[PDB]
Write an enzyme that holds these catalytic residues in place. Structure first.
Site, short mmCIF file in Angstrom:
data_model
loop_
_atom_site.label_atom_id
_atom_site.label_comp_id
_atom_site.label_asym_id
_atom_site.label_seq_id
_atom_site.Cartn_x
_atom_site.Cartn_y
_atom_site.Cartn_z
N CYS A 1 30.33 45.21 58.73
CA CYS A 1 30.19 44.00 57.84
C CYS A 1 31.36 43.10 58.29
O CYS A 1 31.44 42.94 59.55
CB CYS A 1 30.47 44.60 56.52
SG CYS A 1 31.77 45.56 56.12
N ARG B 1 32.15 47.92 53.59
CA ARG B 1 30.89 48.23 53.21
C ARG B 1 29.93 49.08 54.34
O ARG B 1 29.00 49.93 53.93
CB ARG B 1 30.01 47.08 52.87
CG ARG B 1 30.44 46.23 52.01
CD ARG B 1 29.91 44.88 51.83
NE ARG B 1 30.67 43.80 52.73
CZ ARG B 1 30.08 42.63 52.89
NH1 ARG B 1 29.07 42.15 52.31
NH2 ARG B 1 30.71 41.88 53.79
#
Length: 407
Positions: A361, A366
């Site tokens: 990301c 994430r």
């Protein structure tokens, strides 16, 4: 009132679907008692009665359509009576017209399906029981540590945390300039300080799952063999009403000798050039876990990242509504969504377990969560590309894709 009960075989003959009304921990494979049945009935959907008060009519309706439930096709519910009745009532109000009990549900343990490594995504009662010295399923083979992870110095932890939980500041594992992981030597010091050897079990939780996940994946890279997450993080413990402890982190006895050479699993992290080499292939995927506005280039997601756009050739893995949410992986209670559902989400974008897959990301948090879920799902060749968009885009020569686009 319920339609005629159905056995699984009758359900299959009548083209119906089973719905497991239990919390996801049990659906995933956790037994409800020692050596008890492990998992869900074949092709069952999970609609936990515990989620209902957090699902709107719209949300349940979307869930019904996303799982191709036809109004009049039989659905057979199982789980505890009270949870089954609660689900039945909502589904009736949503307009499903053939709702029954699955009368032989869980009666044949050998036929049930589970997360290959469900035991990596733990839940609150398990951890309470563990702490209390009880026998538990998939017990740590040896010593274990429970650790809350968040950005910066302990804040909410001071007010409340899980009993006996240590705290790690994510700044212990990653740093400026690029928010890539600190050096192998620095991880060695961090592991030692937190009482972690390679054969120490580590169970990580955060107010946000991705904080925990990020620490977790970097510990798996280093070589901690048994690393797990509290599924849904802190709010599950809170919600369960289990005991809490407060105040500053207590002293931990250091482990100066990790006991294998760090990193034991270097392949779990990829650098820019390794990431580059996954692109434009069927047997690999470099996977963007960024919000769709990030992915099409409306925003970068981050105040400190000026460039906008995406790694050209990267496949979208879904994520959340902005750079700090992960709705596309969560149930209403914040737990990991059904593996079958994540699997279909990724397959639609040409991301598949038989490929070499690396997630990224803006800086890695994430991607770390999705990494841990793919690990739990049994995906054998997964990693995180640490540098991600912040690194990729810091060089103007790297190719950038922009705008609305499909698989």
């Amino acid at each position: 009132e319920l339609a005629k009960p159905l056995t699984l075989d009758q359900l299959q003959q009548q083209n119906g679907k089973a719905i497991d009304t239990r919390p996801s921990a049990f659906y995933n494979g956790w037994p409800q008692t020692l050596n008890g049945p492990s998992g869900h009935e074949l092709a069952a959907l999970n609609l936990s009665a515990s989620w209902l008060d957090k699902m709107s009519t719209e949300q349940l309706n979307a869930w019904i359509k996303q799982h191709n439930l036809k109004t009049d096709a039989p659905v057979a519910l199982y789980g505890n009576d009270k949870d089954v009745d609660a689900v039945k009532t909502r589904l009736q109000k949503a307009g499903l017209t053939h709702i029954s009990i699955l009368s032989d549900a869980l009666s044949e343990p050998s036929r049930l399906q589970k997360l290959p490594h469900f035991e990596q995504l733990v839940y609150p009662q398990w951890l309470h029981d563990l702490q209390q010295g009880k026998e538990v399923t998939a017990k740590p083979a040896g010593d274990w540590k429970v650790i809350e992870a968040a950005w910066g110095a302990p804040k909410l932890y001071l007010i409340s945390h899980i009993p006996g939980a240590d705290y790690i500041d994510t700044n212990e594992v990653e740093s400026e300039p690029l928010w890539n992981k600190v050096s192998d030597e620095q991880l060695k010091a961090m592991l030692a300080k937190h009482g972690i050897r390679h054969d120490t079990t580590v169970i990580l939780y955060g107010r946000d799952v991705y904080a925990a996940a990020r620490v977790a994946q970097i510990m798996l890279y280093a070589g901690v063999k048994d690393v797990r997450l509290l599924d849904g993080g802190w709010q599950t413990w809170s919600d369960a009403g289990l005991p809490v402890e407060r105040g500053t982190p207590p002293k931990v006895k250091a482990e100066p000798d990790f006991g294998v050479k760090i990193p034991a699993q270097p392949q779990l992290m990829l650098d820019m050039e390794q990431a580059r080499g996954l692109l434009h292939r069927q047997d690999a995927s470099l996977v963007s876990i960024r919000s769709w506005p990030e992915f099409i280039g409306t925003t970068s997601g981050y105040s400190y990242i000026k460039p906008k756009g995406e790694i050209a050739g990267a496949r979208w893995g879904h994520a959340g509504s902005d750079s700090t949410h992960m709705e596309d992986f969560h149930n209403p209670d914040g737990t990991m969504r059904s593996a079958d559902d994540i699997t279909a989400m990724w397959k639609a974008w040409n991301i598949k377990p038989e490929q070499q897959v690396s997630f990224y990301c803006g800086t890695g948090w994430r991607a770390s969560e999705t990494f841990m879920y793919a690990r739990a799902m049994g995906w054998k060749n997964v990693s995180v590309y640490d540098g991600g968009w912040y690194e990729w885009s810091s060089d103007p020569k790297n190719p950038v894709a922009t705008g609305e686009r499909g698989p």
